[PDB]
Scaffold this motif. Sequence first.
Motif: not given
Length: 620
Positions: A390-396, A540-552
């Motif tokens: 179950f991917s946690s990737d939000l990039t899309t 953005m930094r929203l990838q699977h396995g990355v807890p420290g996320r950001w959007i510019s």
Amino acid sequence: IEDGINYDPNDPTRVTLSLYAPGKSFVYVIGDFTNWEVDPAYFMYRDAPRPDSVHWWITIEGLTPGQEYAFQYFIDGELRLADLFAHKVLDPWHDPFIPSSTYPNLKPYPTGKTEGIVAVLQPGAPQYQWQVTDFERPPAHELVIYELLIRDFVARHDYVTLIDTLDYLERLGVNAIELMPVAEFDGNISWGYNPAFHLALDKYYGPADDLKRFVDECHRRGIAVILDVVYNHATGNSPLVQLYGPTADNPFINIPARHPFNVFYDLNHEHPYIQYWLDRANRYWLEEFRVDGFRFALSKGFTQKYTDDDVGAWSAYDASRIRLLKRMADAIWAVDSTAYIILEHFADNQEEKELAAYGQDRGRAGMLLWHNLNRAFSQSVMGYLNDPNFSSDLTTIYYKNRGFPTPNLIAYMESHDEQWLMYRMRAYGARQGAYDVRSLPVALDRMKLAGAFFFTVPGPKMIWQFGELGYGYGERGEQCLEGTGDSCPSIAPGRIDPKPIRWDYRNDPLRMKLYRTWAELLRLRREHAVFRSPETQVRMRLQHGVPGRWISLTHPELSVVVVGNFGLEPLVVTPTFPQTGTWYDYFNGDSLVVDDPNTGIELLPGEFRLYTNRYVGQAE
Ligand SMILES: OC[C@H]1O[C@H](O[C@H]2[C@H](O)[C@@H](O)[C@@H](OC[C@H]3O[C@H](O[C@H]4[C@H](O)[C@@H](O)[C@H](O)O[C@@H]4CO)[C@H](O)[C@@H](O)[C@@H]3O[C@H]3O[C@H](CO)[C@@H](O)[C@H](O)[C@H]3O)O[C@@H]2CO)[C@H](O)[C@@H](O)[C@@H]1O
Ligand SMILES: OC[C@H]1O[C@H](O[C@H]2[C@H](O)[C@@H](O)[C@@H](O[C@H]3[C@H](O)[C@@H](O)[C@@H](O)O[C@@H]3CO)O[C@@H]2CO)[C@H](O)[C@@H](O)[C@@H]1O
Ligand SMILES: [Ca+2]
Ligand SMILES: [Mn+2]
């Protein structure tokens, strides 16, 4: 003359009735105005320029202006059919359960005089006086849609009560409401995906003039109304099924269905009469109720391509299906060139891009497509970012990351078909030491975090009723949706059954902090083009396995950085700020000095911050 009930705008004493029915022998109209007798005066004319182009018609004279009359077509001495194009029916089985408080002065069924559903006609019907003249529907790519099930949104389940919720919805900051299906469905209690009379308004939600009042009141507030509509299939009570029966000889239907995930009787969208009926239905709802567009349920089902029970084969690019949806879209846009065409599609990206692009070279918005991010947001708010299944990737979430050149994807964390995020957090949430995602206050904070990584991203968005108050789990786990893969508690209702209604959540200050956070994000989005614009530059930094996320986000009017900790312990999260200088924390009112674009910010687990490159005020 069209098939259905043809009023004479200059003679409220007559109607012309017309039925499409090749292969029949004779038809009488029976109804209140025949005393439910078979009368040679009501023997319909056969208009048959070709054996496949047979329409039965009659003009009925001498009716009383403003009076309702029930009727059926009595075909071949063997079939009693309510009009396919009826706008109101009396249902003998279910109408007795509709309270007079729901539908005042409801016409009694003609018990003992006929059987089965009857159609209702009413010449010289009083006309609702529409009040709003200068409503401008939001740009399709800026929609922020509230998905609403009338049955479970208000206990009175009716249009007049919906009107009383609009201060709440307007303050939340949505600019469209999507009603789950309002068209006449089997029975009274339903999600609505069992349609019987696709151009009739289900009476369990109240009278037509109250829906008109609701739409007018939405429009007064700058809120659009979208109707969820269900044209893949029809129940056995639909005249499309009854006219020839659920048989091999019925050209309107497919038995078996052509594709997976069919319910009821799969319709043949290549049939010219089904195309006519579909166009009539889309035109009717736009013209009569002044709605702003449609969510086409199971639009992937609009095909005769045979894929049996193969979901992969069904989801593949289907040129025939694309032709049929463009043909439907052309007819909608000939009625109203800016009506929303929203597809609940879930086809392969090649097909979805082609449907999104359609008409844009001619000034149309293109079709909008449902974009389901429930699983990725579920994993993200639960705090499981490393699940191989179950991917946690939000990039899309950003349309260009899905290969789209324009913002035609309606992203959602939640829909009526998906589990509540709050159920998943309270049921399965991760924990580390003192930090427990299963704890209600912790989970509400993670929904604020989820909103900050959702409402801030350009392109249209949808939310599902009461997510903004933390709906899900409830007292003991009963607020659980069956059929999502989760094993709901034994105490939960069935997937399609009525769910608890919890307006008392407005009296919980912790739940209202979530509402006010989402409201403040949607106010930011309304007030600053950066959040909405197709010209916004996104990193953005929203990838699977990355807890420290950001959007510019960068735009001429404003630059934004959102930072969030999807982990379970304090974490330094290092966005790449798009410019050095002093940035301003919108919710907390403090500043951040960025002298290195890569600036670390220590965040608590579940915390977000939103920074702007200039001072634009503070959250209230
Ligand atoms: O008969 C008593 C029951 O009546 C009501 O139930 C209705 C139900 O409310 C209504 O929606 C319809 O269910 C069909 C399926 O609806 C949903 O699927 C739709 C998606 O939600 C939608 O987003 C998409 O666009 O379209 C989908 C339909 O194509 C559910 O997710 C499905 O589970 C429903 O299927 C169930 O019913 C079908 C057909 O009867 C059954 O074959 C299927 O296997 C089931 O899984 O019709 C229902 C009546 O049959 C009432 O709500 C119930 O409480 C009550 O018991
Ligand atoms: O057991 C260790 C396990 O922990 C993590 O798995 C979690 C899942 O990522 C998360 O989805 C949730 O699983 C539930 C599903 O969401 C639900 O749909 C249904 O299938 O029940 C599941 C719970 O049984 O919670 C689990 C933890 O319980 C981690 O990501 C895994 O890699 C790891 O193996
Ligand atoms: Ca009904
Ligand atoms: Mn189909």
